[PDB]
Design a protein around this nucleic acid. Structure first.
Ligand SMILES: CN[C@@H]1[C@H](O[C@H]2[C@H](O[C@H]3[C@H](O)[C@@H](O)[C@H](NC(=N)N)[C@@H](O)[C@@H]3NC(=N)N)O[C@@H](C)[C@]2(O)C=O)O[C@@H](CO)[C@H](O)[C@H]1O
Ligand code: FES
Ligand SMILES: [K+]
Ligand SMILES: [K+]
Ligand SMILES: [K+]
Ligand SMILES: [K+]
Ligand SMILES: [K+]
Ligand SMILES: [K+]
Ligand SMILES: [K+]
Ligand SMILES: [Mg+2]
Ligand SMILES: [Mg+2]
Ligand SMILES: [Mg+2]
Ligand SMILES: [Mg+2]
Ligand SMILES: [Mg+2]
Ligand SMILES: [Mg+2]
Ligand SMILES: [Mg+2]
Ligand SMILES: [Mg+2]
Ligand SMILES: [Mg+2]
Ligand SMILES: [Mg+2]
Ligand SMILES: [Mg+2]
Ligand SMILES: [Mg+2]
Ligand SMILES: [Mg+2]
Ligand SMILES: [Mg+2]
Ligand SMILES: [Mg+2]
Ligand SMILES: [Mg+2]
Ligand SMILES: [Mg+2]
Ligand SMILES: [Mg+2]
Ligand SMILES: [Mg+2]
Ligand SMILES: [Mg+2]
Ligand SMILES: [Mg+2]
Ligand SMILES: [Mg+2]
Ligand SMILES: [Mg+2]
Ligand SMILES: [Mg+2]
Lengths: 215, 150, 110, 168, 119, 108, 77
RNA sequence: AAUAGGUUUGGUCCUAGCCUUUCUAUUAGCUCUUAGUAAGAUUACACAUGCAAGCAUCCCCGUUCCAGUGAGUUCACCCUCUAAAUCACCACGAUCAAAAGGGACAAGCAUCAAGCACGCAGCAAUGCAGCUCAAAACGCUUAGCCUAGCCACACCCCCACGGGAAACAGCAGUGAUUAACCUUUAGCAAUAAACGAAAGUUUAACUAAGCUAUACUAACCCCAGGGUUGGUCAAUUUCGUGCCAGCCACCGCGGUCACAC
RNA sequence: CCCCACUAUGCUUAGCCCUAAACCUCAACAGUUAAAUCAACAAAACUGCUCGCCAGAACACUACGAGCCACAGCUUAAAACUCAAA
C-alpha cells in the first residue's frame, strides 16, 4: 500500500507550468486578426459571421486610448453594441490601463473602469471585458455632459406572481390538512430576483486565457 | 450475399467430390495390396483354429520380423524444400510451372512445401523450420522481426 | 468528528514495552468464520503512548484514540490500566486478589 | 453430524435469535468468568450460548474474555464517553444477564422498528430496474402498456424501418 | 468516480428495446453516460400510449424538490414535462411552437378553401 | 479434523485442472510430417493409421486418422481434435474428417 | 468523440455555418417569455432551497430533536 | 457431488478412483423456411482510406466528457478532515467529490522462512535500539473486479521535461495471426452531451436500418435433417468382411451364426 | 546354502552419524458399558476435548531446492508422461 513515487510527473508538471509563465503569448499575438481572411493567425480560427462587419469598421479599446495623454484616464468609453440595443447611457469610466508593450502601435492591453449600465453606476472599479472586441467608441469631452444625462424612470414592476397550478393545489392542501383555513393566494416573491440583461458586463478577472499553442 | 454463399458451397462440394474419386482409386489400390497379403498370410494355417495359429504366429514373428523402423522421418541430404511467396497470384503460378519442369529427382528431389501470396510471414518461417526449407520471396518484403526470427 | 482514528476505545494486553513512552498492545476481536459459523480471535498490534512508562508486560490496558496520530504508528494513548499484572483490584469489592482467592478478606471493612 | 457439543449454536437461525442490540455508546465489552464454582455457572453458559448472539448483532463492538482473574465473575462495558458500567453477574442465570444488559444498554422494540422502516423507503415499488434492486425492469411488464417487441411484434406503422420506406 | 467540474442534472435515461422507448427520470452527473450510473431515480415516462390512450408519467415531487434545492439542473424535455403537469410554468418554446403550428395550419386552410372555392 | 484445525487450513483447494494435448482448446491446426501405423495393446490386434503432425503451438504429436482409408501426405494441413484412442497408448489426438485437406470417408 | 490531439477533417476546412434568419416579432416575444420564465423558476428554486435548510437544521438543532436527546440521556442516567 | 448408475474379483463385502445421465457457452462436421427481439475479432500485434468537436458578435468555455479496451493490478468501500465544482451573485448551509490521515479488501505455492532499517522519543540538538513475521512478514506466479456499475490503462520506457519514434485498445474496414472472422449504412427526427441570452447549430454517443441458426419468442398449404440402435441407455432387418478392415464416453466388439465394424 | 581359517566390526575412552516392521502398526487427557452391539478380520463398541496427519495407483524412502561435523548420507519432498484400476 506504499505507492511507488512518480517523480517525472512532478518534474514535468513544474516545467510545463514554468514555460506557460515565461513563453506566454501576449495580447498582440493572441488577438491579432487578418482583415482579408478574417482569421486569427495565432490559431487559424475563423471568426463568427455576425462579427465580420464590425471587425472591419469599429476600433479596439487601446487603439483609441494609445492616442491620449495617459491612455484616457477618467474618460468614458461606450460600445457600439450598447448604443444600438439600449437607449440609456452605458459606459465605463477608465481608472487604470496596462498597455501591451509588444505591439508596434500599442493597440492591445487591459483596462479597469467603473461601469454605468443603463444609467446605474457601480460602487467600485473592476476589470473591463471585451477589450479586444471591435465595438468601442470614445465619448467626446464636450458631449460627455449630454451623453451622461439620464433621468431614472419608475421601476415599479410585478412583485408577486402566482404559483404554477399543481404546486398551488398542494400548498392549499397542506393548509387544510393542518387545519389552517385561509382564502389568500400563494404567491412567489419575484422582487428579490433582479433579472439582468444578457449583455451585462461579466467579470474578466475570473475569466481564462488562451494557452500558448500557436498554429 | 446468401445466394453467393450457396454457389461457393456447391462449387466446393463439386471440387471435393472430384478429389475423392482420384483418392478413392489410390485407397482401393492400397487396400487391395494389404488384403492380398492378409488372405495369403493365413494360407499356411488354413482350416485351423485360431488358438493353434497364435502359438505358431507368436513363434513365426521371431523368424521373419526384423527390428522396427523409426517412426520419425529421416532427412535426406539431396532434398530441397522451398516455400514460394509471391506478390501477385499470376506471378506465383509462373514460378510453379518452372518447378513442374524439374526432371532430376534421381539426384536431388524438390518439394514445394507451401505457396501463397503476400509478404513473408511467421507461418512460412515455421514451415521452413519444420521441413528444413528455404523461403523464396519473389518481389515481396520481409519485416525486420521476421529476419531476426529466421 | 473528534478524531481521525477508526478505533476509539480498545482493550488489549501489553506484550512489550521496549520503546520510549510507547507500549505495544495486542488487541483481540471475535471474527466469525463464514463456513464453520464459529467465532475466533483475530489479534492485532496497537502502539500506545505511555508518558510515565507505567505499563508492565502482561497487563490489560484501555486505549483512547488520539485526535491525530502523533507518530507513524502511534494512534492511541493509555487511558487506564484495567488489570495490573499481579496486582488486580476486584471491581466488585475493591479488594486485592491473587486469582480466585482474596488476599484481603472483604469483611475487614464490612 | 455437526462437530462439537451443541452444534445448533453454529447456525444462522440461532445467531439471529439475540435480542440484545447495543447502543452507539457501547464500544468495548469485557467478560470476566471463572471456569469452576457453582456461583459462576451462569456466566459460563452466557459465554457458551449468548456471547455468539451478541457479537453477531454487534460486530463493531469488541468482546474480550478473561479467565480466573478475579474471585467472582462480572461484565464491564466501556462507553464512548469514558463511562464504565460494571455488572456483577454472580449468582445469576444466563437468561437474567441477557435480560439485564438489554434493559440498561440495549435498544427497545420501538427504536428497532424505526430503523427497519427506514430501509423500506430505499426500495421504491414504482422504480424500474434490475431484479436485484427493483421489482420490474421495464414498463412493458405492466398490463395495458405496449409489450416488449421480443414477445409481441409491434405494428409495421410503429417501426422505423417501414416509416423510412413509407416516407421515401 | 470524480469528474473535473460538472454538476447534477435531472434528465431522462432512455430504456427499452428497439421501437419501444421507455424513459426513466433520474438525477445523475452531467458527465455520466445517459443510461449509466445515477444518484437517484425520480420517476418514469412512457411515450407510447396505452390501451386507454394515455401516457404515464411518474413524478417523485418530494425528491425532485430536494435535488433542485441541492443544485441540480433540469433538461429541456424534463422542463416540459413539469409544465404539462403544472409543477413548473409552460416552457416558452412550448408556447412558441404552438403558435408556429397554428400559423402553419391556418396557412393550409386557405389553400384548401381556395381549391374548393376556385375549383 | 477439529474446528480449530478446519479454520487454520481453510476451504479445500481444488488441484488446478491439468490441460491436455489441445491446451484446453477445442481443435488445433497442424501440418502432416509422417504417415505410419501402430499396433494395439493386447488383446486387440490391428494396424491403425496414425500421423505425426506439428501443431500451431509448436509441439509435434501423434494423431489418429479415423475411418476406412485416407490420402494424407507430407506437408498437408489437417484440423485435429481431442479424444483418446483407447487401443493406442499415448495417442490423444484425432484428425477431423471433412476439414482442410483431409476428406470425408468415401462411401463403401 | 474526437480529442484535442486529433487533426481536423479536410472536408470541413472551408465550412461556414451561417446563422438562421430572425423574425423580429417572434424573436422579441420569445426573449421576454424566457425573461419571465426564468424569473418564475428562480423564485421556486429558492423556495426549494429554503426547505432543505430547515429540514437539515430541524434534525440536529430542532425542538423535537433536542427534546429526545435529553429523554435518551435522562433514561441512561 | 443426486432419487442415482456402470466398471476391480474365480466370487463376496468394504473402500476408492475413472466414466455415464443433467444444464450452459465456444468451436467443428453434416444440414437449414420465415418473422420479431437480444448479443456479436481469437490477439494491449501492425494499420491504406474516410468520418468521429464544435459553439459563438471576436473573449472565454468545450474538445479532461461520451465512446473503447483488458496490458497491468489489493488507488474502488466506510469514517475523519477538507479544495475545485453546481445552487445567478456576496454570504449561508446543503449537495457532489479529489488529495491527505485511519481502517477494510483476490487466488495458488512455505520446496518463498526469515525481511534488512523496515521503529520510538524529543521544540531542537540529538538519544535509545528497535519494527514486521508460522494467526504467514518478505517474495514468486496467476488474474481485471465485489457488475444499476466500478477500477485501471490510453503505442512503448510505471510517470513523460526528455528519448525511442511517428501510434484506430473511437465507428466502419484491412493485413498478419487464431479452432475463433458483422456494413469501408443513413440521420441528428427522439433522448444525452457541448456551446449560446436565445431561435438554434454540431456529434460514427445515440437512434433507426444491414450481415450472421449464437440465443430467446412466434408461426408455417408445400417443404427435415442430424446423431444414435451390445449393456449403462430409448431403439436393427438382411447382406459383406473374417482379430483383417474398422468401432466405443466406460465396460468392451471383430479369429466364417457379428443385435457392437 | 554346508565345512575350515581369518579380518573390519561387536568391547573401553572421546567425538560424530540420527536410521528401523523405532509395530503393542491401535496418539495425549477424561469418561461410559446403556442404546441401533458390530461391514470383515484383528485386540468388543462408543462419547467429550485437543494436537498431528491423510484424500485413486504408480512414478517416489525419487528429482530440484534448503538445512545438517552427515559428502555413495539423512531430513523435508513435487510434477510430467502412464493406467482404469490398485
Ligand atoms: C474388468 N476389466 C478387467 C481389466 O481389463 C482391462 C485391462 O487393463 C490393462 C490396461 O489395458 C493396460 O494398459 C495396463 N498396463 C499397464 N502397464 N499399466 C494393465 O495394467 C491393465 N490391467 C489391469 N489394471 N488389471 O486390459 C484392458 C484392455 C481392460 O480390458 C480395459 O478395460 O483388467 C484385466 C486384467 O488386466 C481383467 O482381465 C479385466 O476383467
Ligand atoms: S424490456 Fe421493456 S421493451 Fe424490451
Ligand atoms: K479383441
Ligand atoms: K486485465
Ligand atoms: K503504461
Ligand atoms: K438530436
Ligand atoms: K463559446
Ligand atoms: K455375418
Ligand atoms: K509389531
Ligand atoms: Mg475402453
Ligand atoms: Mg470379470
Ligand atoms: Mg464407484
Ligand atoms: Mg453448428
Ligand atoms: Mg468510460
Ligand atoms: Mg468549494
Ligand atoms: Mg482520497
Ligand atoms: Mg523444488
Ligand atoms: Mg491479464
Ligand atoms: Mg504512458
Ligand atoms: Mg494499436
Ligand atoms: Mg475498429
Ligand atoms: Mg483478416
Ligand atoms: Mg464467433
Ligand atoms: Mg454524419
Ligand atoms: Mg442492429
Ligand atoms: Mg452396424
Ligand atoms: Mg578382531
Ligand atoms: Mg522395539
Ligand atoms: Mg500427542
Ligand atoms: Mg498416490
Ligand atoms: Mg529409509
Ligand atoms: Mg533423497
Ligand atoms: Mg539435494
Amino acid at each position: 500500500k506504499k505507492v511507488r513515487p512518480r517523480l517525472i510527473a512532478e518534474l514535468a508538471r513544474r516545467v510545463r507550468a514554468l514555460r506557460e509563465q515565461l513563453n506566454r503569448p501576449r495580447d498582440s499575438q493572441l488577438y491579432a486578426v487578418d482583415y482579408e481572411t478574417l482569421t486569427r493567425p495565432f490559431s487559424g480560427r475563423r471568426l463568427p459571421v455576425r462579427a465580420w462587419a464590425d471587425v472591419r469598421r469599429e476600433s479596439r479599446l487601446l487603439q483609441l486610448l494609445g492616442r491620449l495623454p495617459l491612455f484616457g484616464l477618467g474618460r468614458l468609453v461606450t460600445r457600439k453594441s450598447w448604443l444600438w440595443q439600449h437607449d440609456e447611457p452605458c459606459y465605463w469610466r477608465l481608472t487604470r490601463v496596462r498597455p501591451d508593450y509588444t505591439a508596434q502601435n500599442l493597440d492591445h492591453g487591459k483596462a479597469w473602469g467603473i461601469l454605468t449600465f443603463k444609467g446605474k453606476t457601480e460602487s467600485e472599479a473592476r476589470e473591463i471585458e471585451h477589450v479586444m472586441y471591435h465595438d468601442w467608441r470614445l465619448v467626446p469631452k464636450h458631449e460627455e455632459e449630454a451623453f451622461t444625462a439620464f433621468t431614472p424612470a419608475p421601476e415599479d414592476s410585478l412583485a408577486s406572481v402566482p404559483y404554477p397550478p399543481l404546486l398551488r393545489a398542494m400548498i392549499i392542501a397542506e393548509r387544510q390538512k393542518n387545519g389552517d383555513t385561509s382564502t389568500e393566494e400563494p404567491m412567489l416573491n419575484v422582487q428579490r430576483i433582479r433579472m439582468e440583461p444578457w449583455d451585462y458586463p461579466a467579470k474578466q478577472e475570473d475569466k481564462g486565457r488562451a494557452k500558448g499553442t500557436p498554429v | 450475399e446468401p445466394r453467393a454463399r450457396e454457389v461457393v458451397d456447391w462449387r466446393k462440394y463439386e471440387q471435393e467430390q472430384e478429389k475423392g474419386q482420384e483418392d478413392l482409386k489410390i485407397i482401393e489400390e492400397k487396400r487391395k495390396e494389404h488384403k492380398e497379403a492378409h488372405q495369403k498370410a493365413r494360407e499356411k494355417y488354413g482350416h485351423l483354429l485360431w488358438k493353434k495359429r497364435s502359438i505358431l504366429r507368436f513363434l513365426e514373428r521371431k523368424e521373419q520380423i526384423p527390428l522396427k523402423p523409426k517412426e520419425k522421418r529421416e532427412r535426406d541430404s539431396n532434398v530441397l524444400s522451398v516455400i514460394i511467396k509471391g506478390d501477385v497470384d499470376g506471378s506465383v503460378e509462373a514460378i510453379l510451372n518452372i518447378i513442374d519442369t524439374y526432371d532430376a529427382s534421381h539426384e536431388c528431389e524438390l518439394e514445394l512445401v507451401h505457396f501463397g501470396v503476400g509478404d513473408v510471414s511467421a507461418n512460412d518461417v515455421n514451415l521452413a523450420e519444420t521441413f528444413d526449407g528455404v523461403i523464396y520471396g519473389f518481389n515481396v518484403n520481409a519485416g525486420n522481426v521476421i529476419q531476426q526470427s529466421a | 468528528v473528534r478524531s481521525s482514528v477508526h478505533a476509539r476505545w480498545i482493550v488489549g494486553k501489553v506484550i512489550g514495552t521496549k520503546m520510549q513512552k510507547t507500549a505495544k498492545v495486542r488487541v483481540t476481536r471475535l471474527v466469525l468464520d463464514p463456513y464453520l459459523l464459529k467465532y475466533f480471535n483475530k489479534r492485532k498490534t496497537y502502539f500506545a503512548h505511555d508518558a510515565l512508562q507505567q505499563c508492565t508486560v502482561g497487563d490489560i490496558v484501555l486505549l483512547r484514540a488520539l485526535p491525530v496520530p502523533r507518530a507513524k504508528h502511534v494512534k492511541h494513548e493509555l487511558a487506564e490500566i484495567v488489570f495490573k499484572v499481579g496486582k488486580v483490584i476486584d471491581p466488585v469489592t475493591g479488594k486485592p486478589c491473587a486469582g480466585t482467592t482474596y488476599l484481603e478478606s472483604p469483611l475487614s471493612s464490612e | 453430524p455437526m462437530k462439537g457439543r451443541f452444534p445448533i449454536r453454529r447456525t444462522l437461525q440461532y445467531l439471529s435469535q439475540g435480542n440484545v442490540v447495543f447502543k452507539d455508546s457501547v464500544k468495548v465489552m469485557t467478560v470476566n468468568y471463572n471456569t469452576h464454582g457453582e456461583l459462576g455457572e451462569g456466566a459460563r453458559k452466557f459465554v457458551f450460548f449468548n456471547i455468539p448472539q451478541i457479537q453477531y448483532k454487534n460486530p463493531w463492538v469488541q468482546i474480550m474474555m478473561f479467565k480466573n482473574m478475579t474471585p467472582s465473575p462480572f461484565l464491564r462495558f466501556y462507553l464512548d464517553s469514558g463511562e464504565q458500567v460494571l455488572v456483577d453477574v454472580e449468582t445469576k442465570s444466563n437468561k437474567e444477564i441477557m435480560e439485564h444488559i438489554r434493559k440498561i444498554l440495549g435498544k427497545n422494540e420501538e427504536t428497532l422498528r424505526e430503523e427497519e422502516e427506514e430501509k423500506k423507503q430505499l426500495s421504491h415499488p414504482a422504480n424500474f430496474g434490475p431484479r436485484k434492486y427493483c421489482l420490474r425492469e421495464c414498463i412493458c411488464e405492466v398490463e395495458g402498456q405496449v409489450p416488449c417487441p421480443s414477445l409481441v411484434p409491434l405494428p409495421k406503422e410503429m417501426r422505423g424501418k417501414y416509416k423510412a420506406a413509407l416516407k421515401a | 468516480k470524480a469528474y473535473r467540474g460538472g454538476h447534477l442534472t435531472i434528465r431522462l435515461a432512455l430504456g427499452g428495446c428497439t421501437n419501444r422507448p421507455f424513459y426513466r427520470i433520474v438525477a445523475a452527473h452531467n458527465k455520466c453516460p445517459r443510461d449509466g450510473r445515477f444518484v437517484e431515480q425520480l420517476g418514469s415516462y412512457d411515450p407510447l400510449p396505452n390501451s386507454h390512450g394515455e401516457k404515464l408519467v411518474a413524478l417523485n415531487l418530494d425528491r425532485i424538490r430536494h435535488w433542485i434545492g441541492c443544485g441540480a439542473h433540469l433538461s429541456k424535455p424534463m422542463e416540459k414535462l413539469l409544465g404539462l403537469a403544472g409543477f413548473f410554468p409552460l416552457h416558452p418554446m412550448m408556447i412558441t411552437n404552438a403558435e408556429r403550428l397554428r400559423r402553419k395550419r391556418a396557412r393550409e386552410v386557405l389553400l384548401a378553401s381556395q381549391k374548393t372555392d376556385a375549383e | 479434523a477439529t474446528l480449530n484445525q478446519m479454520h487454520r487450513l481453510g476451504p479445500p483447494k481444488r488441484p488446478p485442472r491439468k490441460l491436455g494435448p489441445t491446451e484446453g482448446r477445442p481443435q488445433l491446426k497442424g501440418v502432416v510430417l509422417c504417415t505410419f501405423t501402430r499396433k494395439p495393446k493386447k488383446p486387440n490386434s490391428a494396424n491403425r493409421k496414425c500421423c505425426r503432425v506439428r501443431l500451431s503451438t509448436g509441439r509435434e504429436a501423434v494423431c489418429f486418422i479415423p475411418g476406412e482409408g485416407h490420402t494424407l501426405q507430407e506437408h498437408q494441413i489437417v484440423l485435429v481434435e481431442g479424444g483418446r484412442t483407447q487401443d493406442l497408448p499415448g495417442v490423444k489426438l484425432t484428425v477431423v474428417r471433412g476439414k482442410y485437406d483431409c476428406g470425408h470417408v468415401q462411401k463403401k | 468523440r474526437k480529442t484535442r490531439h486529433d487533426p481536423l477533417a479536410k472536408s470541413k476546412i472551408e465550412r461556414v455555418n451561417m446563422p438562421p434568419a430572425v423574425d423580429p416579432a417572434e424573436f422579441f416575444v420569445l426573449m421576454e417569455r424566457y425573461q419571465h420564465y426564468r424569473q418564475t423558476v428562480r423564485a421556486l428554486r429558492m423556495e426549494f432551497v429554503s426547505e432543505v435548510q430547515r429540514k437539515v437544521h430541524e434534525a440536529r438543532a430542532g425542538v423535537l430533536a433536542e427534546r429526545k436527546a435529553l429523554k435518551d440521556a435522562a433514561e441512561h442516567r
